[PDB]
């Protein structure tokens, strides 16, 4: 997703958008997998944000828009109860917050 | 199809109240943002909600009615003559029933002349002592005024936290049979017998005698009535609807008495310097509630509050 | 809330000012709808159109129709004067 | 296709154009009169 | 002798200059007008109730706009008399009532235009009393506000009371809403004007609510809704309280009460507690119009 | 497998040039999501 | 009946007279008429366009 080239990134984003149709199978395989996909999308769009809008290249903005739309699709497909489950990651769990 | 519905977020978003600009903290100011979420877990929230509920939206007054017989100077006898039946002129009862309708104190949703049994939203001859304030009370209400007429009777054998309303206004009406007994009226001795319960509130009996004015009704032998009013002169002279030494027929007696009571109470409220309209009191109470119960959250922290379920806070 | 009772084919309410208007008997929008003496349009936060319309009293009212960038929605509301139960 | 705009962008632009064109500036007296009675009196 | 009495009373009112005498005369006029009106209702036209009321209103308004401006007690007496005459239930031409409200509004304009050194607490008290009298006149006769001129004058007076200056000016540039600085004469005048606006917007017309004349606010609260829902899940914490613009407090319940048969659609129970008073609501979300409510 | 069938007579969604009279067909597959709506012009459903 | 006075009676509820009463009540019950709202709130000219 965070590849320097944008065409391969766009193809990867489309492939991720494809997986939304099999979220039931992903849940049956591993419980936390769809939440992991949503976290991956959130982190990627956060990382690409600082150098996206403060630039004169439209391709980065278009890729950001595509990332946001895929995130919206993933959120809509998932139920509300799953989205409210806390994020379980080592770096943040080390902190007392 | 979906089953559950969190309609609150739909309502906030559809009307345009919920937005990033609305939730943004004001710059260089202390007023809260345009949208604020309160808390139902901080102790005393429901008590303050009840405080806000008990505040009325329109001014209210109180009127006491007494009956006098010749050769009476003690408060006990004056209170006693009322509670008897068939021992007074029928014109007194006719004048009473022309002041307002009758409403039970328990089922009355408005002012009833006594704090402890007022604003209760949760629903053989005895004479004019029924209206003593324990079973029934004469009531009148308009779009801008509310009056509770109560006739005191002899006394025989924190749960309602009300914020200070302001200077209570009450006017007494006395039915005298002989004009010479007007001066011999024990107004001082009956101050303790006409406590409305607002004395504990209204914090913002000798000194209260001058505050209350008195209206005297003296029937004549020709059917007309003679009126004398004491202690109703202030900065703006006297009140017009019933001047001193006036004569009024029985047709326009109750209406003129009610108008005089309204004008006197309005003048008394306007004269005092520690009085504000009830909507100002409600606005100040709302501002105090906002200051003491607002939730300090950022914009992203507030959207996620809508999706989280409520009602299980004390159960989970 | 996406799978509403009307099926996934319908997402935003299809109602408008012409519907349930006593002063206009037509089923399509027309200038007579604006000629109604009980219709008014407002702009809120410079990014929302709010339409207030007092329908004839159906019983078990105020009708609010809102148009924004997310679509259009309709609200039917009535006051509760008397006590309950 | 050149200058192709998504649905939400077109809807937002059209809504902004409508608001800008049809917005009415008036004194508070006229606004309160209109709120009190939509048709003139 | 009734005609002679009325004529001499009118002459005494016209020729009087002392304050106390004028107050007594005004009280007598109110008494006689009310008595004649009630007698006619229960049963040169100067003896007639309608003509007597018209003449009384005309004389009082003329005196108020002519001489009773530099005096406080006399002006307050005239305001109380004009407030008293509203309660009289006698058919009369709307022109007289329009003239009365026009005179009251002109008095408001004159008093609020006094120089700053002459301003005092008594002036603001008189302004508040006149606002209350105007509110009583509007409430007792909601019909006459259908006129363009009466409504325009009333709203101009309210705007002058709130903002401190009328939006329209004879020669000065006009001002619009939003870009007008708030410069009220005083806090009391501003509060009175706001109360008048709230009354004319909500209480004007249909004063007795189905809840009863005793309580203008709705007689339903959180406890009533909880005990009426008859659902163990609903508790005192099920509500979500919101504050709008630091003035309005909401209390929203996200459970249908069964009032609407559309159990398949969202329902909310807004419970507004504003500065005017408590008021309930029941909003519903509908996707299809009334033509196919039962066809879904 | 490309979507459920919708009766064109009483369909309130996207049309894509189809007609209510039934000349262009009576049924057609339909697949729509929270943000994407797709309708197929199947050639084996339109009478010829 | 001239010397007879009518006893006061409780007034009965009366339906609102205006054709825009409920919408106006809803507008003024949400604070839309407060001083602060007089900036980000306006009207729309009603015409064919």
Residues of C in contact with B19 (CB under 8 A): 45
How many Å apart are CA E142 and CA E208, to the nearest integer? 13
CB-based contacts of B2: which residues, under 8 Å, 6+ apart?
C1, C2, C3, C4
Query: Would you say B257 and B278 are in contact if contact means Cβ atoms under 8 Å apart?
Result: no
Experimental method for this entry?
A: cryo-EM
Tokens standing for residue B95: 């004048």
* Nearest-by-Cβ selection for E260 from C12, C60, C83: C60
DSSP code for A49: S
Residue E41: phi and psi, rounded to 5, are -65, -40
Residue with tokens 């007289």: E96
**Interchain CB contact of A80 with B (< 8 Å):** yes
Neighbors of chain D by Cβ distance (3+ pairs < 8 Å): C, E, G
Query: Would you say B236 and B267 are in contact if contact means Cβ atoms under 8 Å apart?
Result: yes
Cα dihedral C17, C19, C22, C26 sign:
positive
CB-based contacts of D31: which residues, under 8 Å, 6+ apart?
E177, G42, G43
Tell how strand B61-68 and strand B146-150 pair up: parallel
H/E stretch holding G25 reads: helix G21-29
Residues of G in contact with C31 (CB under 8 A): 48
Please calculate the CA angle E213-G23-B19 and round it to the nearest 5 degrees.
120
Query: Would you say E57 and E92 are in contact if contact means Cβ atoms under 8 Å apart?
Result: no
Provide the β-strand partners of residue G43: C42, D24
The side-by-side arrangement of strands in the sheet containing C49-53 is D23-24, G41-44, C39-44, C49-53, C62-68, C71-78, E282-285, E267-268
What Rg value do the Cα atoms of chain C yield, rounded? 15
Shortest CA distance to B251 belongs to which of E86, G3, E90, E30?
G3
Contact E155 D40 (CB under 8 A): no
Residue with tokens 């053989």: B124
Query: Would you say B268 and G23 are in contact if contact means Cβ atoms under 8 Å apart?
Result: no
Tokens standing for residue G40: 């980000």
Tokens standing for residue B295: 């939730």
How many Å apart are CA A30 and CA B87, to the nearest integer? 93
Residue E278: phi and psi, rounded to 5, are -65, 145
Query: Would you say B304 and A86 are in contact if contact means Cβ atoms under 8 Å apart?
Result: no
The side-by-side arrangement of strands in the sheet containing F27-32 is F4-7, F27-32, F37-39
**What is the CB-side half-sphere exposure of residue E204 using CA atoms within 13 A?**
28
Cα dihedral E206, E208, E211, E215 sign:
positive
Whether there are 3 or more C-beta pairs closer than 8 Å between C and G is: yes
What's the start-to-end Cα distance of chain C, in Å?
31
How many Å apart are CA A86 and CA E265, to the nearest integer? 31
CB-based contacts of A65: which residues, under 8 Å, 6+ apart?
none
How many Å apart are CA A34 and CA B88, to the nearest integer? 89
Tokens standing for residue G36: 């602060």
- Determine whether E99 is exposed, middle or buried from the number of CB atoms within 10 Å of its CB (0-12, 13-18, 19+): middle
At CB < 8 Å, which residues of chain E contact C? 209-211, 218-220, 224-225, 227-228, 257, 259-261, 264-266, 270, 279-291, 296
Query: What's the gap in Å between the CA of C66 and the closest CA on chain B?
Result: 7
Tell how strand B214-219 and strand B170-176 pair up: parallel
**Interchain CB contact of E272 with G (< 8 Å):** yes
Per residue in E51-68, is it b (16+ CB within 10 Å) or e — as a string?
Answer: ebbbbbbeebbebbbeeb
C-beta neighbour count of E289 within 10 angstroms: 16
H/E stretch holding G28 reads: helix G21-29
* Nearest-by-Cβ selection for G38 from D25, D28, D34: D28
Residue with tokens 């005004």: E26
How many Å apart are CA E56 and CA A40, to the nearest integer? 84
DSSP code for F34: S
Shortest CA distance to E287 belongs to which of C73, C77, C71?
C73
How many Å apart are CA C29 and CA C11, to the nearest integer? 21
HEC letters along chain E: CHHHHHHHHHHHHHHCCCHHHHHHHHHHHHHHHHHHHHHHHHCCCCCCHHHHHHHHHHHHHHHHHHCCCCCCHHHHHHHHHHHHHHCCCCCCCHHHHHHHHHHHHHHHHHHHCCCHHHCCHHHHHHHHHHHHHHHHHHHHCCHHHHCHHHHHHHHHHHHHHHHCCCCCCCCCCCCCCCCCCCCCCCHHHHHHHHHHHHHHHHHCCCCCCCCCCCCCCCCCCHHHHHHHHCCCCCCCCCCEEEEECCCEEEEEECCCCCCCCCCCCCEEECEEECCCCEEECEEEECCCCHHHCCCC
Provide the β-strand partners of residue B170: B62
CB-based contacts of F8: which residues, under 8 Å, 6+ apart?
F18, F19, F20, F22, F24, F25, F26, F27, F28
How many Å apart are CA E66 and CA E93, to the nearest integer? 23
Query: Would you say E137 and E199 are in contact if contact means Cβ atoms under 8 Å apart?
Result: no
Per residue in C63-77, is it b (16+ CB within 10 Å) or e — as a string?
Answer: bbbbbbeeebbbbbb
Tell how strand B146-150 and strand B35-37 pair up: unpaired
What's the start-to-end Cα distance of chain G, in Å?
65
Q: How far is CA B76 from the centre of its chain?
A: 27
Please calculate the CA angle E131-E150-E63 and round it to the nearest 5 degrees.
60
How many Å apart are CA B236 and CA E74, to the nearest integer? 8
How many Å apart are CA E202 and CA G16, to the nearest integer? 10
Q: What is each CA distance from B161 to B147, B153, C33, in whole angstroms?
A: 22, 27, 52
Residue E217: phi and psi, rounded to 5, are -75, 155
How many Å apart are CA B21 and CA G35, to the nearest integer? 18
- Determine whether E237 is exposed, middle or buried from the number of CB atoms within 10 Å of its CB (0-12, 13-18, 19+): middle
CB-based contacts of E183: which residues, under 8 Å, 6+ apart?
E163, E164, E165
- Determine whether E250 is exposed, middle or buried from the number of CB atoms within 10 Å of its CB (0-12, 13-18, 19+): buried
Tokens standing for residue B25: 């903290």
CB-based contacts of E141: which residues, under 8 Å, 6+ apart?
E86, E97
How many Å apart are CA B45 and CA B49, to the nearest integer? 6
CB-based contacts of E5: which residues, under 8 Å, 6+ apart?
none
Query: Would you say B227 and B215 are in contact if contact means Cβ atoms under 8 Å apart?
Result: yes
Query: Would you say B246 and E31 are in contact if contact means Cβ atoms under 8 Å apart?
Result: yes
Residues of B in contact with G10 (CB under 8 A): 101
How many Å apart are CA B77 and CA B70, to the nearest integer? 11
How many Å apart are CA B142 and CA E83, to the nearest integer? 13
Query: What's the gap in Å between the CA of D24 and the closest CA on chain E?
Result: 11
E23 torsion bin: left (phi>0), alpha (psi -120 to 50), beta (else): alpha
How many Å apart are CA E231 and CA E221, to the nearest integer? 16
Shortest CA distance to C77 belongs to which of E286, B287, E72, G45?
E286
HEC letters along chain B: CCCCCCHHHHHHHHCCCCCHHHHCCCCCCCCCCCEEECCCCCCCHHHHHHHHHHCCCCCCEEEEEEEECCCCCCHHHHHHHHHCCCCCCHHHHHHHHCCCEEEECCCCCCCCCCHHHCCCCCCCCCHHHHHHCCCEEEEEECCCCEEEEECCCCCCCCCCCCCCCCCCCEEEEEEECCHHHCCCCCCHHHCHHHCCCCCCCCCCCCCCCCCCCEEEEEECCCCCEEEEEECCCECCECCCCCCCCEEECCCCCHHHHHHHHHHHHHHHHHHCCCCCCHHHHHHHHHHHHHHHHCCCCCHHHHHHHHHCCCCCCCCC
What's the start-to-end Cα distance of chain F, in Å?
24
- Determine whether B297 is exposed, middle or buried from the number of CB atoms within 10 Å of its CB (0-12, 13-18, 19+): middle
What's the start-to-end Cα distance of chain B, in Å?
28
Q: What is each CA distance from E188 to B11, B131, E123, E195, in whole angstroms?
A: 36, 37, 11, 11
Residue with tokens 């009476």: B72
Residue with tokens 């007598």: E28
C-beta neighbour count of B12 within 10 angstroms: 21
What's the start-to-end Cα distance of chain A, in Å?
29
Tokens standing for residue E264: 């398949």
- Determine whether E147 is exposed, middle or buried from the number of CB atoms within 10 Å of its CB (0-12, 13-18, 19+): middle
Residue E29: phi and psi, rounded to 5, are -65, -45
Residue in chain G lying closest to B255 (CA): G8
Contact G20 D38 (CB under 8 A): yes
Residues of C in contact with B1 (CB under 8 A): 3-5
B71 torsion bin: left (phi>0), alpha (psi -120 to 50), beta (else): left
Contact G35 E182 (CB under 8 A): yes
How many Å apart are CA G7 and CA B250, to the nearest integer? 12
**What is the CB-side half-sphere exposure of residue F1 using CA atoms within 13 A?**
1
Please calculate the CA angle E244-E248-E252 and round it to the nearest 5 degrees.
80
Per residue in B255-269, is it b (16+ CB within 10 Å) or e — as a string?
Answer: bbbbbbbbbbbbbbb
Residues of F in contact with A73 (CB under 8 A): 33-35
Shortest CA distance to A68 belongs to which of A83, A87, A48?
A48
Tokens standing for residue E187: 């806090």
Give the resolution in Å: 3.8
3 state SS of F28? strand
Shortest CA distance to E278 belongs to which of B285, B54, A73, B229?
B54
Q: What is each CA distance from B131 to B65, B112, B193, in whole angstroms?
A: 10, 11, 15
Q: What is each CA distance from B126 to A31, A35, B87, B129, B251, in whole angstroms?
A: 80, 78, 11, 6, 26
CB-based contacts of E258: which residues, under 8 Å, 6+ apart?
none
* Nearest-by-Cβ selection for E177 from D27, D40, D41: D27
Which among D25, D31, D32 is the top mutation candidate for probing chain E, defined by the most E β-carbons within 10 Å of its own β-carbon?
D32
Q: How far is CA B99 from the centre of its chain?
A: 17
F22 torsion bin: left (phi>0), alpha (psi -120 to 50), beta (else): left
DSSP code for G3: S
Cα dihedral F19, F24, F26, F27 sign:
negative
What Rg value do the Cα atoms of chain D yield, rounded? 17
């Amino acid at each position: 997703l965070k590849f320097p080239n944008k065409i391969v990134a766009q193809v990867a984003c489309d492939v991720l958008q494809l997986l939304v149709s099999y979220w039931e199978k992903l849940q049956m395989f591993e419980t936390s997998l769809p939440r992991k996909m949503a976290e991956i999308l959130v982190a990627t769009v956060a990382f690409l944000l600082p150098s996206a809008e403060y630039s004169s290249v439209e391709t980065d903005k278009k890729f950001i828009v595509s990332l946001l739309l895929c995130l919206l699709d993933w959120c809509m497909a998932l139920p509300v109860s799953v989205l409210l489950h806390p994020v379980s990651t080592a770096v943040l769990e080390e902190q007392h917050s | 199809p979906a089953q559950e519905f969190q309609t609150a977020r739909l309502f906030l978003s559809h009307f345009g109240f919920l937005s990033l600009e609305a939730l943004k903290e004001p710059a260089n100011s202390r007023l809260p943002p345009h949208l604020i979420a309160l808390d139902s877990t901080i102790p005393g929230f429901f008590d303050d909600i009840g405080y806000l509920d008990l505040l009325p939206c329109r001014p209210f007054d109180t009127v006491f009615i007494f009956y006098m017989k010749p050769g009476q100077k003690t408060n006990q006898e004056i209170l006693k003559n009322v509670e008897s039946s068939r021992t007074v002129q029928p014109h007194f009862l006719e004048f009473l029933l022309s002041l307002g309708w009758s409403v039970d104190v328990g089922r009355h949703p408005g002012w009833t002349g006594h704090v402890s049994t007022s604003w209760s939203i949760n629903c053989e001859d005895i004479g004019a002592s029924i209206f003593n304030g324990q079973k029934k009370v004469l009531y009148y209400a308009d779009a801008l005024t509310e009056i509770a007429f109560v006739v005191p009777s002899p006394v025989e054998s924190q749960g309602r936290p009300v914020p200070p309303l302001g200077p209570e206004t009450r006017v007494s009406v006395v039915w005298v049979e002989r004009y010479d007994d007007i001066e011999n009226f024990p107004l001082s001795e009956l101050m303790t017998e006409i406590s409305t319960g607002v004395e504990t509130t209204a914090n913002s009996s000798t000194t209260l005698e001058k505050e209350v004015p008195v209206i005297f009704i003296h029937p004549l032998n020709t059917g007309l009535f003679r009126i004398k009013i004491q202690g109703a002169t202030g900065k703006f002279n006297m009140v017009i609807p019933l001047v001193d030494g006036m004569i009024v027929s029985r047709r326009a007696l109750g209406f003129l008495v009610r108008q005089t009571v309204i004008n006197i109470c309005r003048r008394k409220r306007l004269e005092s310097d520690s009085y504000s309209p009830p909507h100002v009191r409600r606005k100040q109470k709302i501002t105090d509630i906002v200051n003491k119960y607002r939730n300090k959250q950022l914009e992203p922290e507030f959207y996620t509050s809508l999706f989280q379920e409520v009602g299980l806070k004390n159960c989970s | 809330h996406y799978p509403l009772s009307g099926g996934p084919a319908i997402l935003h309410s299809l109602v408008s000012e012409n519907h349930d208007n006593a002063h206009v008997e037509g089923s399509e929008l027309s200038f007579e709808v604006f000629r109604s003496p009980n219709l008014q349009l407002f702009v809120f936060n410079d990014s929302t159109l709010i339409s207030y319309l007092q329908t004839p009293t159906e019983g078990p009212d105020v009708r609010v129709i809102v148009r924004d960038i997310s679509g259009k929605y309709s609200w039917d509301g009535k006051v509760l004067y008397g006590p309950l139960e | 296709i050149p200058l192709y705009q998504s649905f939400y962008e077109e809807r937002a632009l059209y809504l902004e154009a409508i608001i800008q064109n049809h917005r009415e500036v008036m004194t508070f007296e006229d606004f309160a009169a209109q709120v009190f009675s939509p048709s003139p009196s | 002798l009734k005609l002679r009495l009325v004529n001499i009373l009118i002459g005494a009112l016209q020729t009087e200059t002392d304050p106390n005498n004028t107050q007594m005369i005004l009280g007598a006029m109110l008494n006689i007008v009310q008595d004649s009106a009630l007698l006619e209702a229960i049963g040169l036209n100067t003896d007639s109730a309608a003509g007597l009321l018209i003449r009384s209103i005309h004389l009082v308004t003329q005196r108020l706009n002519s001489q009773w401006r530099q005096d406080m007690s006399i002006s307050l007496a005239a305001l109380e008399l004009l407030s008293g005459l509203a309660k009289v239930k006698v058919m009369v031409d709307s022109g007289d009532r329009k003239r009365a409200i026009s005179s009251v509004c002109t008095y408001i304009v004159y008093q609020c235009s006094r120089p700053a050194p002459l301003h005092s607490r008594d002036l603001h008290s008189m302004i508040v009393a006149a606002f209350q009298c105007l509110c009583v006149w509007l409430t007792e006769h909601p019909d006459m506000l259908d006129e363009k001129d009466c409504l325009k004058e009333v709203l101009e007076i309210v705007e002058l009371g709130i903002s401190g200056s009328k939006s329209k000016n004879n020669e000065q540039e006009v001002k619009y809403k939003g870009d007008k600085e708030p410069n009220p004469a005083s806090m009391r005048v501003k509060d009175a004007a706001e109360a008048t606006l709230t009354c004319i917007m909500q209480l004007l017309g249909a004063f007795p609510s189905p809840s009863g004349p005793a309580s203008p606010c709705s007689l339903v609260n959180e406890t009533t809704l909880i005990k009426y829902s008859r659902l163990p899940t609903i508790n005192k914490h099920s509500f979500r309280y919101f504050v709008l613009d630091n003035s309005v407090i909401l209390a929203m319940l996200e459970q249908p009460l069964g009032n609407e048969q559309n159990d398949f659609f969202p329902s909310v129970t807004v419970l507004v507690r504003g500065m005017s008073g408590r008021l309930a609501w029941a909003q519903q979300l509908c996707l299809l119009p009334r033509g196919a409510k039962a066809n879904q | 497998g490309l979507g459920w069938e919708v009766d064109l007579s009483t369909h309130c969604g996207f049309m894509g040039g189809l007609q209510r009279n039934g000349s262009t067909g009576q049924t057609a597959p339909y697949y729509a999501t929270s943000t994407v709506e797709v309708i197929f012009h199947v050639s084996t459903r339109m009478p010829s | 009946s001239a010397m007879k006075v009518t006893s006061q009676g409780q007034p009965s509820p009366v339906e609102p007279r205006g054709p825009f009463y409920f919408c106006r009540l809803l507008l003024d019950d949400l604070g839309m008429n407060s001083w602060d709202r007089r900036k980000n709130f306006h009207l729309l000219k009603k015409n064919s366009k």
